[PDB]
Every structure is written in structure tokens, then in C-alpha cells.
């Protein structure tokens, strides 16, 4: 626990370098601002230096839970090898817890100014549908209409 | 000249959101009114001054003007 507190704290600064996670790290933060949504996934480092055992058994207890769980597996198998292991080894898991708050969208923006570096990676976006509403079938074709570009291909 | 070529800056964060999302005159009655005060009392007392001699000198131009024309007891 301890040893890994430090090995948190050497990414931040590694991911410093990881721009284009900067991003997206920036680009969530503001959208959904004031929600937890906005929140990094590796955290302040001010929370990784006051973490507890404890807020993680909290974490453990409450989150891996059969119902909102899930397991899968593809190649050269059965799905009947498999069930028994599920009821072999997982069955002993306890099988029984908060539902969503809507994640509201934002329109606003951020600017980390820096003239010192040789480039800007820059990113822009709206409000998404969701996962179950179908027109992201659509949105998928558009983003491929537009498609992508970087600097290497001979077309 | 334009951006882009002006000047260096370095470490700074700017955070700014649409105007749809904020209603135009927030606190105006409730905080500008203050301001507006604070804003009085940095500047009246250089600048009234000169308009309170203006007053005066206005008022004293018109009196010693209005008394000359009236006559003198001869």
C-alpha cells in the first residue's frame, strides 16, 4: 500500500507527458463539472497520499457485487465447463448498493495556455446520447465520414 | 499583427463557460451597487473639486455682474 503510494505519484508526473490523456482529463473535468463524472480515474495526488484501507474494503464492499458483475470468455471451450467453475468458485461470493445520478452536459471551456512547448493537442466535443439510444449507430458514420488524418499517410 | 506571434506565458489556466449557461445580470442590484460606491469614493474627491469652484465661480460671476449694472447712489 505503501510502496504503490509512491508509484502513484511517480505516473502523475509521467502522464505530464501523456498530452493527449491531459485531454481528455481536461475535457471531462468541465462538461460534467460538479459531478463526480469530472473526476480523474488515478485521483488527486492528495487523495492518493490520505487513502485508507478501510475507504478501499468500503470500495470492495459495496461495488463487487454479483448483480453488477460480470464474466466472459471466448476461444476453444464450452460454456458448461465454464458455468461449473462460476458455481465452483463464485458462488461463494456474496450476491447482495446506490443506482445513478443523470450526469448532466455543460457547455464550457478550458485553456491550459502554454507557449513553451512545440505543439497544442487540442480537443472539442458536445453532449453524447448514451449508450442504448440508437442514433449512435449514426454519430459512429459521421465521426468515419470525417474520419482521421496524422501525418504519415501517402493518400 | 495578430496571435501567435506577440509574446511567452507559461503556466496559466483559464477556465470560462458559455453564456447560455448563466444568466446575464446576476447580482446586479445585489453586488454592483457597492461597487458602484467603491468606485465613487476612489474618485470624487479628485474630481469634484474643480467642479465645486465652478459652482461658485459661476455663481459669483453672475452676482458682481448683476451688481454692476445696478447704479451707484450718485
Request: charged share 20%; hydrophobic share 35%.
Amino acid at each position: 500500500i505503501e510502496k504503490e503510494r509512491d508509484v502513484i505519484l511517480q505516473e502523475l508526473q509521467e502522464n505530464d507527458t501523456s498530452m493527449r490523456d491531459v485531454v481528455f482529463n481536461y475535457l471531462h473535468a468541465t462538461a460534467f463539472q460538479g459531478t463526480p463524472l469530472a473526476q480523474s480515474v488515478e485521483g488527486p495526488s492528495e487523495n492518493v497520499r490520505k487513502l485508507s484501507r478501510a475507504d478501499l474494503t468500503e470500495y470492495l464492499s459495496r461495488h463487487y457485487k454479483a448483480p453488477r458483475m460480470v464474466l466472459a470468455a471466448a476461444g476453444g471451450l464450452e460454456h458448461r465447463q465454464l458455468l461449473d467453475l462460476a458455481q465452483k468458485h463464485f458462488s461463494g461470493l456474496s450476491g447482495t448498493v446506490p443506482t445513478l445520478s443523470p450526469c448532466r452536459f455543460t457547455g464550457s471551456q478550458i485553456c491550459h495556455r502554454e507557449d513553451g512547448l512545440p505543439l497544442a493537442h487540442v480537443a472539442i466535443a458536445v453532449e453524447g446520447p448514451g449508450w442504448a439510444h440508437p442514433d449512435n449507430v449514426a454519430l459512429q458514420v459521421a465521426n468515419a465520414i470525417i474520419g482521421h488524418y496524422d501525418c504519415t499517410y501517402g493518400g | 499583427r495578430q496571435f501567435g506571434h506577440l509574446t511567452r506565458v507559461r503556466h496559466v489556466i483559464t477556465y470560462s463557460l458559455s453564456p447560455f449557461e448563466q444568466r446575464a445580470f446576476p447580482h446586479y442590484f445585489s453586488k454592483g451597487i457597492p461597487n458602484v460606491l467603491r468606485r465613487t469614493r476612489a474618485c470624487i474627491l479628485r474630481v469634484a473639486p474643480p467642479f465645486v469652484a465652478f459652482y461658485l465661480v459661476y455663481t459669483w460671476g453672475t452676482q458682481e455682474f448683476e451688481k454692476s449694472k445696478r447704479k451707484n447712489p450718485a
